[PDB]
Amino acid sequence: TKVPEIRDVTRIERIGAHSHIRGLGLDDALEPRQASQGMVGQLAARRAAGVVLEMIREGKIAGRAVLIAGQPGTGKTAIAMGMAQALGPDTPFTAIAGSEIFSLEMSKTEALTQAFRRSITVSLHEIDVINSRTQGFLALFSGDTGEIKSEVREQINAKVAEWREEGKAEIIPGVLFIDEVHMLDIESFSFLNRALESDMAPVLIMATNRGITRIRGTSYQSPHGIPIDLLDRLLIVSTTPYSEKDTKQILRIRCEEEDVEMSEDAYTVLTRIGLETSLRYAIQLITAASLVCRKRKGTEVQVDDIKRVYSLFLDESRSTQYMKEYQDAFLFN
Amino acid sequence: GAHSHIRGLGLDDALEPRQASQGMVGQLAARRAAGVVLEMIREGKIAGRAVLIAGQPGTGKTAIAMGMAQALGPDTPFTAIAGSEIFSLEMSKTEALTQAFRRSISLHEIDVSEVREQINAKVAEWREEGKAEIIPGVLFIDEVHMLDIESFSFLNRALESDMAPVLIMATNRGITRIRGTSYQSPHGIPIDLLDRLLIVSTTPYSEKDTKQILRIRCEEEDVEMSEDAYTVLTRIGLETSLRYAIQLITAASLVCRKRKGTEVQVDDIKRVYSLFLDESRSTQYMKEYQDAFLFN
Amino acid sequence: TKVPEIRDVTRIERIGAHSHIRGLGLDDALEPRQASQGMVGQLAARRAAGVVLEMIREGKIAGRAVLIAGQPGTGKTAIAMGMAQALGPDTPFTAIAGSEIFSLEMSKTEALTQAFRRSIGVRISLHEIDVINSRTQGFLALFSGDTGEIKSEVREQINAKVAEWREEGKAEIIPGVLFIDEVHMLDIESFSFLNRALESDMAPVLIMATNRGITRIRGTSYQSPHGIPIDLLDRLLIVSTTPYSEKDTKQILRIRCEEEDVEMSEDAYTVLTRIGLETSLRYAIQLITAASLVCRKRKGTEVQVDDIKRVYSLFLDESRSTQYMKEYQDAFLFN
Amino acid sequence: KIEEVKSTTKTQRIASHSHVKGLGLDESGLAKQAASGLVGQENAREACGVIVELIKSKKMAGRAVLLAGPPGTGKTALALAIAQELGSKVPFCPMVGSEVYSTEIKKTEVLMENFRRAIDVTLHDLDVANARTDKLRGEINKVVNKYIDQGIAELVPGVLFVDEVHMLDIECFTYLHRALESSIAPIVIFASNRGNCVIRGTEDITSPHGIPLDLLDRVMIIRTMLYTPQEMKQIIKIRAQTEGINISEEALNHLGEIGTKTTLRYSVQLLTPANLLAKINGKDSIEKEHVEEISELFYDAKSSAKILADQQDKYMK
Amino acid sequence: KIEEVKSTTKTQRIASHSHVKGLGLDESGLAKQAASGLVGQENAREACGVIVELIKSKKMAGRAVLLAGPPGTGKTALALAIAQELGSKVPFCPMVGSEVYSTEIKKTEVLMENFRRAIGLTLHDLDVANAKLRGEINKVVNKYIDQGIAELVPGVLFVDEVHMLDIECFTYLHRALESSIAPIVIFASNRGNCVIRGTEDITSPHGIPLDLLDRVMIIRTMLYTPQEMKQIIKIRAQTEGINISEEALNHLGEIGTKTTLRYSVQLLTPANLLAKINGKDSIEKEHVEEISELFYDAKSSAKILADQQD
Amino acid sequence: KIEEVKSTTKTQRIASHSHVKGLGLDESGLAKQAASGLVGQENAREACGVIVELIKSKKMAGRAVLLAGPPGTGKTALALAIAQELGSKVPFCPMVGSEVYSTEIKKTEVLMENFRRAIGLIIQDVTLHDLDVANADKLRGEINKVVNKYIDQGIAELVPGVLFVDEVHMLDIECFTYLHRALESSIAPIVIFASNRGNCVIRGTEDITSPHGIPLDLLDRVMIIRTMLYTPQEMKQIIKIRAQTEGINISEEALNHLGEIGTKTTLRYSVQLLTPANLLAKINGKDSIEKEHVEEISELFYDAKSSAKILADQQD
Ligand SMILES: Nc1ncnc2c1ncn2[C@@H]1O[C@H](COP(=O)(O)OP(=O)(O)O)[C@@H](O)[C@H]1O
Ligand SMILES: Nc1ncnc2c1ncn2[C@@H]1O[C@H](COP(=O)(O)OP(=O)(O)O)[C@@H](O)[C@H]1O
Ligand SMILES: Nc1ncnc2c1ncn2[C@@H]1O[C@H](COP(=O)(O)OP(=O)(O)O)[C@@H](O)[C@H]1O
Ligand SMILES: Nc1ncnc2c1ncn2[C@@H]1O[C@H](COP(=O)(O)OP(=O)(O)O)[C@@H](O)[C@H]1O
Ligand SMILES: Nc1ncnc2c1ncn2[C@@H]1O[C@H](COP(=O)(O)OP(=O)(O)O)[C@@H](O)[C@H]1O
Say if residues A160 and A198 touch (Cβ distance below 8 Å). Answer: no
Residue B255: partners with Cβ closer than 8 Å, 6 or more residues away? B268, B271, B272, D29, D50
Contact C11, C132 (CB under 8 A): no
Please state, in angstroms and rounded to a whole number, the distance separating the CA atoms of residues C21 and C40. Answer: 10
**Is B206-296 in CATH node 1.10.8.60?**
yes
Q: What is the 3-state secondary structure of chain A?
A: CCCCCCCCCCCCCHHHCCCCCCCCCCCCCCCCCCEECCEECCHHHHHHHHHHHHHHHHCCCCCCEEEEECCCCCCHHHHHHHHHHHCCCCCCEECCCCHHHCCCCCCCCCCCHHHHCCCCCCCCHHHHHCCCCCCCCCCHHHHCCCCCCHHHHHHHHHHCCCCCCCCCCCCCCCEEEECCHHHCCHHHHHHHHHHCCCCCCCEEEEEECCCEEECCCCCCEEECCCCHHHHCCEEEEECCCCCCCHHHHHHHHHHHCCCCCECHHHHHHHHHHHHHCCCCCCCCHHHHHHHHHHHCCCCCECCHHHHHHHHHCCCCCCCCHHHHHHHHHHHCC
Assigned CATH topology for domain C245-335: Helicase, Ruva Protein; domain 3 (1.10.8)
Domain with CATH 1.10.8.60 in chain A: 243-333
What is the sign of the dihedral through the CA atoms of D162, D163, D165 and D167?
Answer: negative
**Of E61, E152, E182, which has the smallest distance from its Cβ to C144's Cβ?**
E182
Interchain CB distance below 8 Å, D277 and A224 = no
Query: Mind spelling out the 3-state secondary structure of chain B?
Result: CCCCCCCCCCECCCCCECCEECCEECCHHHHHHHHHHHHHHHCCCCCCCCEEEECCCCCCCCHHHHHHHHCCCCCCCCCEEECHHHCCCCCCHHHHHHHHHCCCCCHHHHHCCCHHHHHHHHHHHHHHHCCCCCCCCCCEEECHHHCEHHHHHHHHHHCCCCCCCCCEEEECCCEEECECCCCEEECCCCHHHHCCCEEEECCCCCHHHHHHHHHHHHHHCCCCECHHHHHHHHHHHHHCCCCCCCCHHHHCCCHHHHCCCCCECHHHHHHHHHHEECHHHHHHHHHHHHHHHHHC
Q: For domain F230-313, is the CATH number 2.60.40.2140?
A: no
How far, CA to CA in Å, does B103 sit from each of B78, B134, B135?
8, 12, 11
B26 is in an annotated binding site: no
CATH of segment(s) A243-333: 1.10.8.60
Between strands F162-166 and F93-96, the pairing is parallel
Rounded CA separation E181/E288 (Å)? 49
Please list every residue in chain A whose beta carbon sits closer than 8 Å to the beta carbon of residue D297: 44, 47-48, 51, 237
Per the CB < 8 A criterion, the answer to whether C45 and C74 are in contact is: no
- C-alpha dist (Å) from residue E257 to E17, E223, E254, E290: 20, 10, 5, 18
Q: Is there a binding annotation on residue F76?
A: yes
CB E206 within 8 A of CB E66: yes
Ligand 1 cavity residues, CB under 6 Å: A 17-18, 39-42, 72-78, 250, 279-280
The angle subtended at Cα A61 by Cα A56 and Cα A63, nearest 5°, is: 155
- Taking the Cβ of residue A295 and every Cβ of chain F, the question of whether any pair is shorter than 8 Å is answered with yes
Residue of C46, C74, C183 with the most ligand 3 atoms within 8 Å of its CB, for mutation: C74
Count of residues making up chain A: 333
CATH number attached to the domain at F8-117+135-229: 3.40.50.300
* Cross-chain Cβ contact C141/E181 below 8 Å: yes
Instruction: Tell me which CATH code domain A16-120+123-242 carries.
Output: 3.40.50.300
> How many angstroms separate the CA atoms of C2 and D92, rounded?
79
d(CA C209, CA C239): 10
D157 DSSP assignment: -
Backbone angles phi, psi at B126, to 5 degrees: -70, -30
Inform me whether the C-beta atom of residue D196 falls under 8 Å from chain B C-beta atoms: yes
Q: Which residues of chain A are in CATH 3.40.50.300 domains? A: 16-120+123-242
Rounded to the nearest angstrom, the distance between the alpha carbon of B243 and the centre of ligand 2 is 9
Q: CB-based contact (8 Å) between D102 and chain A?
A: yes
Q: Is C107 on the interface with F (CB under 8 A)?
A: yes
Beta-ladder partners of C180: C96, C208
- Please answer yes or no on whether C238 and F303 come within 8 Å at the CB atom: yes
Are β-strands E184-189 and E64-68 bridged in parallel, bridged antiparallel, or unpaired? parallel
Return the CATH class of domain B1-205: alpha beta
* 8 Å CB contact between A185 and F208: no
| Among the bound ligands, the one closest to the CA of C24 | 3
For residue E107, give the amino acid letter: K
Biggest distance spanned by C-alpha atoms of chain A: 79
| Chains F and D touching, counted as 3 or more CB pairs less than 8 Å apart | no
Give the separation between CA B37 and CA E266, rounded to whole angstroms.
Answer: 13
User: Please, which residues 255-284 of chain F have a Cβ atom closer than 8 Å to chain A?
Assistant: none
Q: Are B36 and E294 in contact (CB under 8 A)?
A: yes
| F113 in contact with C, Cβ within 8 Å | no
Residues of chain B with CATH 3.40.50.300: 1-205
User: Percent helix, strand, coil in chain E (nearest 5)?
Assistant: 40, 15, 45
Beta-bridge partners for C224: C215
The radius of gyration of chain A from alpha carbons, rounded to an integer in Å, stands at 23
Quote the ligand 2 centre to C14 CA distance (angstroms). Answer: 64
Instruction: Judge whether F232 is closer than 8 Å to chain A, CB to CB.
Output: no
**Contacts C110 to F, Cβ<8 Å:** none
Q: d(Cα A9, Cα A132) in Å, to the nearest integer?
A: 15
Give the type of residue at C286: Q
Report the number of secondary-structure helices (H) and strands (E) in chain F: 14, 11
The approach used to solve this structure was cryo-EM
Report the alpha-carbon distance of residue E161 to residue E99 in Å, rounded: 10
Using most ligand atoms within 8 A of CB, pick from B62, B169, B201, B247 the residue to mutate for ligand 2: B62
> How many C-beta atoms surround the C-beta of residue D149 within 10 A?
8
Q: Place domain C16-120+125-244 in its CATH homologous superfamily.
A: P-loop containing nucleotide triphosphate hydrolases (3.40.50.300)
Instruction: List Cα–Cα distances, A153 to A101, A129, A132, A149, F75, in angstroms.
Output: 20, 12, 8, 7, 48
Cβ atoms C288, C255 nearer than 8 A: no
Start-to-end CA distance of chain B, whole Å, equals 48
The amino acid occupying position F124 is Q
3-state secondary structure at position E288: helix
Of E102, E103, E274, the CB nearest to B36: E274
DSSP assignments along F126-140, one per residue: -BTTTTHHHH--HHH
